[PDB]
């Protein structure tokens, strides 16, 4: 059998991964390994979407998030040359029991003293733009809302942000979704209380920048959220508080290409959280097998900086990848006519593998 490497444009002194295409050719006992020389290219464009909890627990957090677009760009300057930011909002589904359906409290889901907007599952406040000023202004115009139970419905908002590629404004760059909460999270099954039995189907249900289909769709499962976040090249940054740190820290163990971090009661360290999380993410590379099976098994052996070599799931991962650092991935398709797609998660830049056997 043979690597048959083709269109291997050399990694730029933008190709971050070479070969960018190859066709391996053997089957039983195949150990065909093609070194994916992954070079972290300086100044690769990044799109970011900041999904923010808008329940009353984040009333003070929203004040800090107000001036974030300009600041996040000012800080990702040193990592990328072309960056964009967008904003979304979420509180909870607009039905009982997550809110009280009294006529008096439907306008103000919180207490009488606490003025709150009527509940809304998700509102696309801003679509991706290179203008952080629009981010700041549209975030400031957002009014705090509330719900009744401690967990918040952010998973439907995450799915809505992911699916609407055109309306949100996703580009063919690395996408980051800083999902910020201070309380727990609702998920699939949490909707049975309100009689919301049909789950989040994973489509663009955004009308007038408002997820008006709250009452019809349930919060998605963590598996479906993972599928939609990975399939759309979105690296989540679960910025959550310390009271739920043993919650989202375990959550990151299941969700690929994530990096949880702790914030204060007012999310004051959200920018440092994003920077450190993306430093962990970029210095990481979870190559994906894309989707291929029944005749293909990929074993991985990374050889990253400082001589550390991983095996299996460890071998699929590299660490301590500096700016321009070259790592070698002993990617061995064991197999045991098709062109499947190998992607470093969070990267639209791709290598093409054809197992013509």
């Amino acid at each position, epitope marked *: 059998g043979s690597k048959d490497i083709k269109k291997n444009k050399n990694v730029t002194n933008i190709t971050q991964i070479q070969p960018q295409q190859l066709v391996l050719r053997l089957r039983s006992g195949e150990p065909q390994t093609f070194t994916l020389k992954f070079k972290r290219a300086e100044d690769y464009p990044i799109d970011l979407y900041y999904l923010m909890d808008l329940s009353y627990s984040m009333k003070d957090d929203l004040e800090n998030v107000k001036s974030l677009g300009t600041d996040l760009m000012n800080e990702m300057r*040193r990592i990328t040359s*072309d960056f*964009r930011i967008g904003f979304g909002s979420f509180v909870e589904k607009t039905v009982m029991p997550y809110i009280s359906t009294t006529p008096a409290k439907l306008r103000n889901p919180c207490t009488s003293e606490q003025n709150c907007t009527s509940p809304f599952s998700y509102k696309n406040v801003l679509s991706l733009t*290179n203008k952080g*000023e*629009v981010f700041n202004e549209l975030v400031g115009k957002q009014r705090i809302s509330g719900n009744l139970d401690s967990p918040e419905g952010g998973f439907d908002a995450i799915m809505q942000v992911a699916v609407c590629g055109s309306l949100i404004g996703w580009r063919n760059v690395t996408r980051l979704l800083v999902f910020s909460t201070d309380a727990g999270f609702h998920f699939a099954g949490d909707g049975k209380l309100g009689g919301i039995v049909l789950p989040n189907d994973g489509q663009c249900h955004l009308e007038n920048n408002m997820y008006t289909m709250s009452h019809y769709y349930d919060y998605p499962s963590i598996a479906h959220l993972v599928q939609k976040l990975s399939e759309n090249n979105i690296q989540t940054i679960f910025a959550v508080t310390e009271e739920f740190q043993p919650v989202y820290k375990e959550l990151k163990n299941l969700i690929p290409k994530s990096a949880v971090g702790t914030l204060s009661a007012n999310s004051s360290n959200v920018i440092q959280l994003i920077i450190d999380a993306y430093n962990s993410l970029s210095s990481e590379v979870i190559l994906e097998n894309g989707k291929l099976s029944e005749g293909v098994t990929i074993s991985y052996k990374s050889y990253c900086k400082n001589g550390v070599n991983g095996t299996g799931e460890n071998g699929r991962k590299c660490s301590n990848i500096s700016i321009g650092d070259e790592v070698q991935f002993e990617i061995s398709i064991t197999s045991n006519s098709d062109s499947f797609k190998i992607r470093p998660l969070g990267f639209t830049e791709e290598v093409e593998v054809i197992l013509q056997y």
Partner: antibody
Amino acid sequence: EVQLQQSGPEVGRPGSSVKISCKASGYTFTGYILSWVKQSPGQGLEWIGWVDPEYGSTDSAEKFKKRATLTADISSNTAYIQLSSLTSEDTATYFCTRYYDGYYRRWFAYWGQGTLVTVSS
Amino acid sequence: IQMTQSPASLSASLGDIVSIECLASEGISNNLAWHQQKPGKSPQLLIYGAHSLHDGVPSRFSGSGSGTQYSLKISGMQPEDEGVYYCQQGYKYPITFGGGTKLELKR
């Protein structure tokens, strides 16, 4: 060549409203933020604020949030600044300026010819 | 952020090299630009990204610095170099400018 053809020198009364235009040509009017940089005769540049033809949002400094009603027209590729509650002390030149692609490159690369409005009675 | 760019005004001989500094109130991470104001005309961009040169600008202009301190170095002046020079920051809002240096060549 990106050009910003502004209206002629406007004349307004103290307390009235004037609508300075900026017929932006040579670039996507909606795709780029358009800012106004007031420049009094003999003074420096003060950033009034900005318009956004894409989503319609505007944000100004603390001195122009309630006074200068900034607006943009998508169809005509023309942006307006409404000097509500004018004062004769604001007789100056108003520039419509385009950022250098935006992002952190918030540099005023392109400047219009200047609308020297003469607000007087 | 308020940029008290130095100096207020200066005059130098023909062909002399001069550095104009724009110190920022906080580290702006190379978020500084430069503009030149010819009389009766709109200002023109000279240096973007605190190091790079704008198209159509003579190569005598140069930008440097990082963090908080930045410099606008002009490799020799000419009569075409007259104008008022403003350093523009892009870190916080509102956008801030310098006081403007009157680069009037002497004779």
